Amino acid sequence: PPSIGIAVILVGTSDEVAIKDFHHLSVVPRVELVAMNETDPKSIITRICDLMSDRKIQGVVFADDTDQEAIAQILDFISAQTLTPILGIHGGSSMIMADKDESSMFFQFGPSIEQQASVMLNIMEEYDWYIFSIVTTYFPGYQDFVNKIRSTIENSFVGWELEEVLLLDMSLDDGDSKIQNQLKKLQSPIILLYCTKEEATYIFEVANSVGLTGYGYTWIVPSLVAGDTDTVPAEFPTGLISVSYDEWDYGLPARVRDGIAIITTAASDMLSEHSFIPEPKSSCYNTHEKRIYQSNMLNRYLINVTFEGRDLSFSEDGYQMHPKLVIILLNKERKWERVGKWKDKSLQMKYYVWPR
Amino acid sequence: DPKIVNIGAVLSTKKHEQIFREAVNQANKRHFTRKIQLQATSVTHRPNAIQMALSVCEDLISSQVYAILVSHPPLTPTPISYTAGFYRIPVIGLTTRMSIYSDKSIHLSFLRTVPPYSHQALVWFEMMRLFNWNHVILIVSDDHEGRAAQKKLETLLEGPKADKVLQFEPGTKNLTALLLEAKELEARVIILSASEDDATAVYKSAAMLDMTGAGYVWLVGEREISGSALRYAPDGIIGLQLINGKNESAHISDAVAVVAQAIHELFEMENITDPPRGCVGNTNIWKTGPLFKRVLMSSKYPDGVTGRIEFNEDGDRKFAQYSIMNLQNRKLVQVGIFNGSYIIQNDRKIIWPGGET
Ligand SMILES: *[C@@H]1O[C@H](CO)[C@@H](O[C@@H]2O[C@H](CO)[C@@H](O[C@@H]3O[C@H](CO[C@H]4O[C@H](CO)[C@@H](O)[C@H](O)[C@@H]4O)[C@@H](O)[C@H](O[C@H]4O[C@H](CO)[C@@H](O)[C@H](O)[C@@H]4O)[C@@H]3O)[C@H](O)[C@H]2NC(C)=O)[C@H](O)[C@H]1NC(C)=O
Numbered sequence: 001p002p003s004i005g006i007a008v009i010l011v012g013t014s015d016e017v018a019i020k021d022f023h024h025l026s027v028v029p030r031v032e033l034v035a036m037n038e039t040d041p042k043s044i045i046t047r048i049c050d051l052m053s054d055r056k057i058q059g060v061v062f063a064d065d066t067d068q069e070a071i072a073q074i075l076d077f078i079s080a081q082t083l084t085p086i087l088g089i090h091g092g093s094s095m096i097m098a099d100k101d102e103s104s105m106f107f108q109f110g111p112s113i114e115q116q117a118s119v120m121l122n123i124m125e126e127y128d129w130y131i132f133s134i135v136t137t138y139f140p141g142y143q144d145f146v147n148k149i150r151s152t153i154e155n156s157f158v159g160w161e162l163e164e165v166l167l168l169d170m171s172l173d174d175g176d177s178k179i180q181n182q183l184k185k186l187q188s189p190i191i192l193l194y195c196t197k198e199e200a201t202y203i204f205e206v207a208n209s210v211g212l213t214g215y216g217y218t219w220i221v222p223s224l225v226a227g228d229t230d231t232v233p234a235e236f237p238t239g240l241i242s243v244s245y246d247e248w249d250y251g252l253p254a255r256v257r258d259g260i261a262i263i264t265t266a267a268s269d270m271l272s273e274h275s276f277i278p279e280p281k282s283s284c285y286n287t288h289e290k291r292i293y294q295s296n297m298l299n300r301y302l303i304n305v306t307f308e309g310r311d312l313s314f315s316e317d318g319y320q321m322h323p324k325l326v327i328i329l330l331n332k333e334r335k336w337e338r339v340g341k342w343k344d345k346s347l348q349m350k351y352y353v354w355p356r
Numbered sequence: 357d358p359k360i361v362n363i364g365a366v367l368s369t370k371k372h373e374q375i376f377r378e379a380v381n382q383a384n385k386r387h388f389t390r391k392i393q394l395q396a397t398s399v400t401h402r403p404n405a406i407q408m409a410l411s412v413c414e415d416l417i418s419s420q421v422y423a424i425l426v427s428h429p430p431l432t433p434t435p436i437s438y439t440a441g442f443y444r445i446p447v448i449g450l451t452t453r454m455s456i457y458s459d460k461s462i463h464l465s466f467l468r469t470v471p472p473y474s475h476q477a478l479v480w481f482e483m484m485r486l487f488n489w490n491h492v493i494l495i496v497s498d499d500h501e502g503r504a505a506q507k508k509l510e511t512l513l514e515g516p517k518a519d520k521v522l523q524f525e526p527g528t529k530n531l532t533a534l535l536l537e538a539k540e541l542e543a544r545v546i547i548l549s550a551s552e553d554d555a556t557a558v559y560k561s562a563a564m565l566d567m568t569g570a571g572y573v574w575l576v577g578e579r580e581i582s583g584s585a586l587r588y589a590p591d592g593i594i595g596l597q598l599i600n601g602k603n604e605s606a607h608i609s610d611a612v613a614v615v616a617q618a619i620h621e622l623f624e625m626e627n628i629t630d631p632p633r634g635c636v637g638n639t640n641i642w643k644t645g646p647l648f649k650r651v652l653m654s655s656k657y658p659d660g661v662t663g664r665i666e667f668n669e670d671g672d673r674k675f676a677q678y679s680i681m682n683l684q685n686r687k688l689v690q691v692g693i694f695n696g697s698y699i700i701q702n703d704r705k706i707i708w709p710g711g712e713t
């Protein structure tokens with residue numbers, strides 16, 4: 001069978017041996033594990049572009065050890081510019097990237113903005129936490145976060161009360177104490193925060209000054225704010241609740257296996273139906289000339305892959321369709337603790353009475 | 357020996373690079389530069405977006421630029437905005453009029469010396485107050501641009517009212533269903549927002565439905581009286597042209613004046629850090645980026661070549677000047693100016709579709 005080149009890019013300390021641990025499809029994968037030390041735009045662009053010139057790269061599987069959401073953005077850009085599938089399977093590469101390019105072939109192992117907002121409301125209905133406020137930054141997806149909450153709350157016969165919706169500008173200096181003034185408006189026992197991990201550290205520092213992080217105030221945050229659970233910023237408040245992707249049972253060697261399976265199956269299926277697959281781009285520096293000879297045709301296949309009887313499919317926004325989410329709580333020892341599971345649109349909490 | 361502060365630029369040609377180099381030199385001459393002295397660093401646009409993103413790193417961020425000026429090429433400012441925005445290095449759009457660059461959420465540190473096409477609603481509104489068009493029909497393309505114009509006009513209206521808004525799919529050639537809706541209505545003042553190719557399709561359909569004659573008024577922007585849109589445009593149409601909108605030399609001159617003043621105002625403050633030297637290994641934002649953005653957003657340069665320079669909440673140019681154009685016997689005639697805040701009608705008489713309403 002024909003051979004497709006797949007680059008597995010690993011940023012940070014990882015067991016390549018454990019990762020290196022079957023496909024009887026129309027095409028076969030030629031996997032090359034690649035190390036990368038830096039995560040700036042130049043480094044990522046250069047690494048991928050160099051790999052594409054050397055081998056015939058059909059798709060990329062990317063994993064990183066960082067809390068850098070901008071990695072998803074750099075990858076989306078590369079993917080759309082070179083019409084090459086890139087899968088963000090771990091780290092900042094899997095952090096929500098709202099409004100991916102029209103020409104994007106970038107897919108992420110992680111929950112969408114909408115699913116997380118939905119999970120958040122399920123946690124609230126469980127403990128009868130109906131009175132709340134929303135705080136977001138301009139981090140892309142904020143509009144999607146607020147709208148999902150709003151639409152849900154509107155079409156529900158439950159006594160939901162959305163007190164305030166704050167929008168904070170992080171792009172300017174806070175020499176005027178605007179954020180502080182805005183945060184002072186907050187009176188709700190529950191606060192839904194949608195922003196980045198680096199933005200949350202600032203928000204929380206100010207929220208504390210205004211006495212909004214203690215007992216009586218519960219902050220619920222998305223996956224990206226918690227980021228890497230081993231990096232707990234000092235300013236994060238004790239009792240912080242977050243949604244997390246299963247880092248416990250869905251390990252890195254499994255994700256790499258699944259990444260390879262998606263690219264290989266999608267290629268096999270396209271070849272089986274059209275008697276061709278896309279020719280891997282020889283260069284990044286001819287994208288302008290060559291674009292009438294290229295398309296994102298493989299997306300119709302990458303979005304719908306099934307392997308070992310597992311529905312590996314993706315949403316129209318390039319996020320995993322059916323993830324197992326974990327509900328985490330930042331304890332008194334400043335360590336993240338598992339307090340719930342989000343399975344088959346069903347939430348299963350550890351506690352009936354939420355503890356202090 | 358002063359501290360050298362680099363200013364970057366992505367310009368169209370080597371002539372324009374020499375204009376930037378000269379504008380920075382004159383800045384150094386006109387200001388007190390014993391403490392801080394500017395240095396011009398520039399490149400021309402690269403053939404593709406990846407090459408451009410790379411060039412921003414390799415040629416500009418490598419030189420520790422405090423800001424990057426960007427002209428629309430002879431391909432967009434997006435890869436420059438994205439790469440510099442990663443570090444929170446402010447970007448100054450000199451000629452880009454697309455509304456999408458006003459979105460703070462995706463263009464993280466971006467200002468422009470030209471307003472977006474949606475700000476043409478400010479002129480239309482003033483035109484409506486002046487000619488007492490209390491009932492209008494707004495036809496917009498169902499794209500970011502079309503919707504940005506609608507959002508902008510609706511804000512000003514909320515006296516004169518928009519009886520109905522009609523959106524169409526970009527690229528649609530048979531618009532007679534949309535225009536038949538508009539014909540049924542009492543209002544005979546039509547405001548259009550569409551690209552050259554889409555404006556052409558509206559004009560062709562409207563002429564077929566005999567809607568480009570007496571009793572009708574067409575109020576349009578710049579894109580709709582440009583290129584092919586002009587070939588099929590009804591006579592009597594009123595459109596706009598942003599004065600100096602396309603003069604990259606004038607915008608280099610004014611952006612450098614604004615940036616130079618902002619740099620000197622910034623160094624009046626304490627704990628000013630340098631931007632990162634190069635991209636490789638640098639993944640944190642420039643800590644002085646947000647303060648420098650605030651200093652820029654609030655800069656006022658009254659004696660600019662393109663006028664009074666100030667920026668709005670989105671860092672878009674305020675007090676922009678427009679030529680009020682009128683298509684008379686298939687010639688574009690200037691009938692007035694929107695000076696930044698007021699309409700000034702010249703001695704050339706408006707000919708409405710037909711004669712005089
Ligand atoms: C775009 O076009 C507009 C419209 O003309 C310009 O705005 C006007 O600019 C002139 C000149 O700068 C201003 O004139 C000054 O008006 C003062 C009184 O203004 C009041 O009354 C007027 C008329 O009713 C109102 O429009 C206005 O809101 C005020 O309530 C006078 O006191 C001034 O006189 C003094 O200064 C002049 C020199 O400037 C001397 O000659 C006099 O001797 C005297 O000392 C003066 O006449 C006018 O106020 C502005 N109008 C508005 C609406 O703001 C814009 O400047 C122009 N923009 C650009 C970029 O060109």
Ligand SMILES: Cc1nccn1Cc1cc(-c2ccc(F)c(C(F)F)c2)cnn1
Binds near residue numbers: 041073099140
């Ligand atoms: C967050 C989001 N949702 C929808 C759009 N965006 C913005 C965005 C940023 C970049 C990006 C960011 C940094 C960087 F350095 C580069 C360089 F690689 F081109 C690109 C690429 N694609 N989209």
Ligand SMILES: *[C@@H]1O[C@H](CO)[C@@H](O)[C@H](O)[C@H]1NC(C)=O
Binds near residue numbers: 037
């Ligand atoms: C990354 O760091 C290790 C440190 O020993 C080095 O061996 C490796 O070559 C570095 N990677 C690159 C791309 O230079």
Ligand SMILES: *[C@@H]1O[C@H](CO)[C@@H](O)[C@H](O)[C@H]1NC(C)=O
Binds near residue numbers: 305
């Ligand atoms: C997904 O894949 C299956 C094959 O397992 C195929 O039969 C089906 O048509 C695909 N679904 C969609 C929605 O395209």
Ligand SMILES: *[C@@H]1O[C@H](CO)[C@@H](O)[C@H](O)[C@H]1NC(C)=O
Binds near residue numbers: 603605606
């Ligand atoms: C462009 O601007 C410069 C001044 O900045 C001027 O010399 C030149 O005449 C202007 N061009 C046009 C076409 O008016």
Ligand code: NA
Binds near residue numbers: 291292293294295
């Ligand atoms: Na193409």
Ligand code: NA
Binds near residue numbers: 384385386387388389
């Ligand atoms: Na001097």
Ligand code: NA
Binds near residue numbers: 458460463671
């Ligand atoms: Na802006």
Ligand code: NA
Binds near residue numbers: 692
């Ligand atoms: Na006139």
